[PDB]
Design a protein around this motif. Structure first.
Motif, PDB file in Angstrom:
ATOM      1  N   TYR A  41       0.833  -1.191   0.000  1.00  0.00           N
ATOM      2  CA  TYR A  41       0.000   0.000   0.000  1.00  0.00           C
ATOM      3  C   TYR A  41       0.874   1.250   0.000  1.00  0.00           C
ATOM      4  O   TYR A  41       2.072   1.201   0.289  1.00  0.00           O
ATOM      5  CB  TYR A  41      -0.944  -0.011   1.202  1.00  0.00           C
ATOM      6  CG  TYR A  41      -1.924  -1.164   1.172  1.00  0.00           C
ATOM      7  CD1 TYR A  41      -3.066  -1.112   0.383  1.00  0.00           C
ATOM      8  CD2 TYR A  41      -1.698  -2.315   1.918  1.00  0.00           C
ATOM      9  CE1 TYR A  41      -3.961  -2.165   0.348  1.00  0.00           C
ATOM     10  CE2 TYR A  41      -2.587  -3.374   1.888  1.00  0.00           C
ATOM     11  CZ  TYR A  41      -3.717  -3.293   1.100  1.00  0.00           C
ATOM     12  OH  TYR A  41      -4.607  -4.342   1.064  1.00  0.00           O
ATOM     13  N   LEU A  42       0.257   2.384  -0.337  1.00  0.00           N
ATOM     14  CA  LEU A  42       1.027   3.597  -0.582  1.00  0.00           C
ATOM     15  C   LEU A  42       1.668   4.172   0.675  1.00  0.00           C
ATOM     16  O   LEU A  42       2.540   5.040   0.554  1.00  0.00           O
ATOM     17  CB  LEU A  42       0.149   4.654  -1.254  1.00  0.00           C
ATOM     18  CG  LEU A  42      -0.473   4.251  -2.595  1.00  0.00           C
ATOM     19  CD1 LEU A  42      -0.882   5.482  -3.386  1.00  0.00           C
ATOM     20  CD2 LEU A  42       0.479   3.385  -3.411  1.00  0.00           C
ATOM     21  N   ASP A  43       1.274   3.723   1.866  1.00  0.00           N
ATOM     22  CA  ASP A  43       2.007   4.100   3.067  1.00  0.00           C
ATOM     23  C   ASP A  43       3.215   3.205   3.317  1.00  0.00           C
ATOM     24  O   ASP A  43       3.936   3.421   4.296  1.00  0.00           O
ATOM     25  CB  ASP A  43       1.082   4.100   4.293  1.00  0.00           C
ATOM     26  CG  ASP A  43       0.678   2.701   4.739  1.00  0.00           C
ATOM     27  OD1 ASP A  43       0.870   1.730   3.977  1.00  0.00           O
ATOM     28  OD2 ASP A  43       0.169   2.575   5.873  1.00  0.00           O
ATOM     29  N   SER A  45       3.153  -0.117   3.940  1.00  0.00           N
ATOM     30  CA  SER A  45       2.832  -1.350   4.643  1.00  0.00           C
ATOM     31  C   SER A  45       2.436  -2.442   3.651  1.00  0.00           C
ATOM     32  O   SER A  45       2.055  -2.176   2.509  1.00  0.00           O
ATOM     33  CB  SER A  45       1.713  -1.119   5.658  1.00  0.00           C
ATOM     34  OG  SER A  45       0.484  -0.832   5.015  1.00  0.00           O
TER      35      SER A  45
END
Lengths: 49, 49
Positions: A41-43, A45
């Protein structure tokens, strides 16, 4: 243990050692296939299944 | 030129269910942008996506 058994009549000790060869295999290639799914995911994680 | 209400026949609706493990959250929501719901919910809970 042999000394203990020579000195005890109603109580006995015993000793043993066994070896191990456990082979690993399923008999066919298709029976051993496996799959996974991974997301990033873009964070940063990650989810894995 | 005046504005306009969307007047979707289904009003805003959502169900948020915590799993009970690792602060996992399942969000069932009538939305156009699940990625954004995931971002703002995770941010509000201080959780990875």
């Amino acid at each position: 243990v042999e000394k203990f058994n020579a000195e005890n009549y109603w109580k006995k000790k015993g000793l043993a050692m066994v070896p191990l060869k456990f082979p690993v295999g399923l008999g066919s290639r298709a029976a051993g296939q496996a799959a996974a799914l991974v997301h990033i995911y873009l964070d940063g994680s990650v989810l894995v299944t | 030129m005046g504005g306009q209400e969307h007047f979707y026949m289904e009003t805003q609706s959502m169900l948020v269910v915590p799993k009970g493990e690792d602060q996992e959250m399942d969000v069932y929501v009538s939305t156009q942008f699940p990625k954004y719901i995931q971002d703002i919910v995770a941010s509000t809970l201080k959780l990875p996506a």
